[PDB]
Design a protein around this ligand. Structure first.
Ligand SMILES: Nc1nc2c(ncn2[C@@H]2O[C@H](COP(=O)(O)OP(=O)(O)OP(=O)(O)O)[C@@H](O)[C@H]2O)c(=O)[nH]1
Length: 412
């Protein structure tokens, strides 16, 4: 009943990383208050408004910095757009929008360097429509300018978030290794660049800013993963979903941010639809799977598992997409294996999933069968995306017929 539903809602959200939660701790408190106080309609109204916010949330990112800093390349890398493609930022004194190719409501803006302009910091922000943005990225390939520190100070005074991004770190490291092959120390180079930049910036700021050292040519390396985590941490909870969807699927961490965001969203949808007192029946599973077809194709698109995206990795292993797909779990996820019935496997899965946030004592909270099928597909899709990152190596060491880990609780 109500008290079991509130405690299982709290237990569900406790399982996620702090920077991944798509609702605030106050949203959680308010939903639990209404459920515990027998105000179930008020609880469902909060959840509906949260889902509307999450689903309609725009994301506008301002990227500012001088010419030669790798700003175009950064804007393209963030969007997953190749340098030669249509929509690519080309590789000069108004702001330019670059829409995300795959997500309507996400725009990366190219702002000209304040140093290109004769404006004060305050007036530069008015001119560039500062109110439109979720945060600012201040990019340099060198050291920063007093110019950048003053702009950051102005942004902080408007109560908004900025991040100093130092590009081309891979080029500086390569040059030093070639210069000093016997005494090269990567960590010393990184510390010396970060320290120079933060020490000069702080001369005009409240406290020591973090500087993120990145390579625009590999978003997996250096401080780029730390930057993605900080950007999530600092966003409003409701904007973390669209930002997670905007990330590449090029690291296990980014795949897991997408997996976690989507699992939270489909749980909220399940709450909105309503808790059930008994395990849902499997009589109509093919009809429920057919109703989810568009959804499962969307999930494939998010994880890079659509047929078009599989072509690149398959030629890479020098095999056909079809041969690669034999070794992935998502195609045959809802197929009978070892003559175990799909309904019996789902009944077992539901008992585990509902035991994880319910435990052995209190009334069990069940949801509609569609919730469990979505949850299962998302875990499978993510585990298939992780395996694609290391396919060559996984393929050699045949750890069974699939290269991916099984989705939690499905196999027995
Ligand atoms: N190795 C490496 N090359 C980079 C990086 N960022 C940009 N580049 C390359 O820099 C070259 C062009 O230099 P820039 O003009 O500074 O690059 P951009 O992205 O066009 O720069 P902006 O003038 O700031 O828009 C291109 O070949 C980019 O691929 C980086 O982090 N590492």
């Amino acid at each position: 009943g109500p008290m079991a539903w509130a405690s299982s809602f709290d237990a569900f959200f406790k399982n996620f990383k702090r920077e991944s939660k798509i609702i605030s701790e106050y949203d959680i408190t308010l939903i639990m208050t209404y459920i515990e106080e027998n105000k179930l309609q008020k609880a469902v109204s909060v959840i509906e408004k949260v889902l509307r916010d999450i689903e309609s949330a725009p994301l506008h990112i301002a990227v500012t910095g001088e010419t030669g800093a790798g700003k175009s390349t950064f804007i393209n890398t963030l969007r997953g757009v190749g340098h030669e493609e249509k929509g690519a930022a080309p590789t000069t004194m108004k702001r330019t929008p670059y829409p995300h190719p795959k997500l309507p409501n996400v725009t990366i803006w190219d702002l000209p360097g304040i140093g290109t302009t004769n404006f004060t910091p305050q007036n530069y922000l008015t001119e560039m429509k500062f109110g439109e943005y979720d945060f600012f990225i201040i990019i340099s390939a060198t050291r920063f300018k007093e110019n950048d520190a003053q702009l950051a100070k102005a942004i902080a005074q408007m109560g908004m978030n900025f991040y100093f991004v130092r590009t081309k770190i891979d080029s500086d490291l390569d040059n030093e290794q070639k210069f000093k092959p016997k005494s090269f120390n990567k960590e010393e180079v990184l510390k010396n660049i970060k320290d120079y930049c933060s020490n000069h910036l702080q001369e005009s700021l409240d406290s020591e800013p973090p500087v993120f050292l990145v390579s625009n040519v590999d978003i997996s390396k250096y401080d780029f993963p730390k930057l993605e985590t900080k950007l999530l941490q600092d966003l409003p909870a409701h904007k973390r979903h669209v930002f997670s969807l905007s990330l590449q699927s090029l690291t296990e961490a980014t795949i897991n941010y997408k997996r976690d965001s989507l699992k939270q969203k489909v749980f909220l949808e399940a709450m909105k639809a309503g808790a059930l007192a008994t395990i849902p029946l499997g009589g109509m599973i093919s009809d429920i799977l057919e109703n989810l077809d568009e959804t499962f194709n969307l999930y494939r698109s998010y994880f890079g598992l659509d047929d078009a995206s599989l072509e690149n990795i398959a030629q890479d292993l020098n095999m056909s997409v079809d041969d690669f797909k034999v070794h992935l779990r998502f195609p045959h996820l809802f197929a009978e294996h070892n003559d175990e019935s799909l309904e019996d496997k789902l009944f077992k899965y539901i008992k585990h999933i509902s035991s994880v946030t319910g435990g052995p004592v209190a009334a069990v909270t069940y949801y509609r069968m569609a919730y469990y099928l979505q949850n299962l597909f998302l875990d499978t899709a993510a585990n298939d995306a992780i395996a694609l990152l290391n396919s060559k190596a996984l393929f050699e060491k045949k750890v069974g017929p699939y290269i991916s880990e099984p989705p939690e609780y499905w196999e027995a």
